[PDB]
Amino acid sequence: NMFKSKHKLDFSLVSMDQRGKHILGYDAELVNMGGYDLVHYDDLAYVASAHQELLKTGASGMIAYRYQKKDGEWQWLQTSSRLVYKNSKPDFVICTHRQLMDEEGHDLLGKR
Ligand SMILES: O=c1cc(-c2ccccc2)oc2c1ccc1ccccc12
């Protein structure tokens, strides 16, 4: 139930596992989709704090949030993020996701 993806430092998508493409339901549309565009409104500030924590410390722990698929439906995801460096400089973002059920996302939502 877990899949990986790679993003630029603005979290625009670069590549994604074929497992994740089947869940999200979007390859041609993957490069046109910048960051924070398909994240739920109630999660944008919390999700942006993980982006700040990623750039500040180099890693972001598992956080639960809602992402919109192609069908318009919201998907509960929990993602851990790590940085890839090019000579000590941050280069890309590597994310590890896990597809969650609605009850699983609600339980992790109540932990923050
Ligand atoms: O909306 C972006 C896309 C993605 C994303 C996730 C799964 C599939 C495709 C894009 O997630 C994030 C985004 C931006 C900031 C994030 C911070 C922490 C964790 C995830 C973030």
Numbering used by the authors: 269 to 294, 296 to 381
Paper text:
The aryl hydrocarbon receptor (AHR), a member of the basic helix–loop–helix (bHLH) Per–Arnt–Sim (PAS) family of transcription factors, plays important roles in regulating xenobiotic metabolism, cellular differentiation, stem cell maintenance, as well as immunity. From the N- to C-terminus, AHR comprises a basic helix-loop-helix (bHLH) domain for DNA binding, two tandemly arranged PAS domains (termed PAS-A and PAS-B) for dimerization, and a transcription activation domain12. The ligand binding site of AHR has been mapped to its PAS-B domain. Here, we present multiple crystal structures of the Drosophila AHR PAS-B domain, including its apo, ligand-bound, and AHR nuclear translocator (ARNT) PAS-B-bound forms.
Among these ligands, only the binding of αNF was detected. The estimated dissociation constant (Kd) of αNF to dAHR PAS-B was approximately 240 nM. To reveal how dAHR PAS-B binds the ligand αNF, we crystallized dAHR PAS-B in the presence of this chemical. αNF lies in the middle of the dAHR PAS-B cavity with a well-defined electron density and forms extensive hydrophobic interactions with dAHR PAS-B. In addition, two H-bonds contributed by the Y334 side chain and the G304 carbonyl oxygen of dAHR PAS-B were also observed. Residues M331 and I332 undergo an approximately 90° rotation, resulting in the side chain of M331 flipping away from the cavity to facilitate αNF insertion. Here, we showed that αNF binds to the dAHR PAS-B domain at a pocket near αE, βH, βG and αD’. Thus, the binding of αNF in dAHR PAS-B is at a canonical position in the pocket of the PAS domain. However, HIF-2α M252 and Y281 are not conserved in AHR, and αNF-binding-induced conformational changes occur outside the AHR:ARNT PAS-B heterodimer interface.
